């Protein structure tokens, strides 16, 4: 939330989402990067 | 034949010499170093409703 002269954090929502292994395997493993995206089932749902 | 004259006998060994003393026997520390100190913090709490 941005105040007058002031900004306050009004959540942090922080998760750890796995890598898939498409993503291990074409990315990771042969060119040492990864996606910016994280595409995961969490809670019963895709999210991206 | 004749009688086997006396044997030499064995001796008490000397014994064994001790110096006295008084001795401290230290062991390996494993216990952590404890100390005092004071946390200051702010338990911030933002509620949606």
């Known amino acids: ?48 | 034949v004749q009688f086997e004259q006396p044997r030499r006998c064995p001796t008490r060994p000397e014994g064994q010499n001790y110096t006295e003393g008084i001795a401290v026997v230290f062991k390996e520390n494993i216990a952590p170093y404890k100390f005092k100190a004071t946390m200051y913090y702010k338990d911030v709490t933002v509620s949606q409703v």
């Open chain 1, 1 to 48: 939330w941005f105040g007058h002269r002031y900004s306050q954090f009004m959540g942090i929502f922080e998760d750890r989402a796995p890598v898939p292994f498409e993503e291990v395997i074409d990315k990771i493993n042969a060119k040492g990067v990864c996606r910016s995206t994280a595409k995961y089932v969490r809670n019963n749902m895709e999210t991206t």
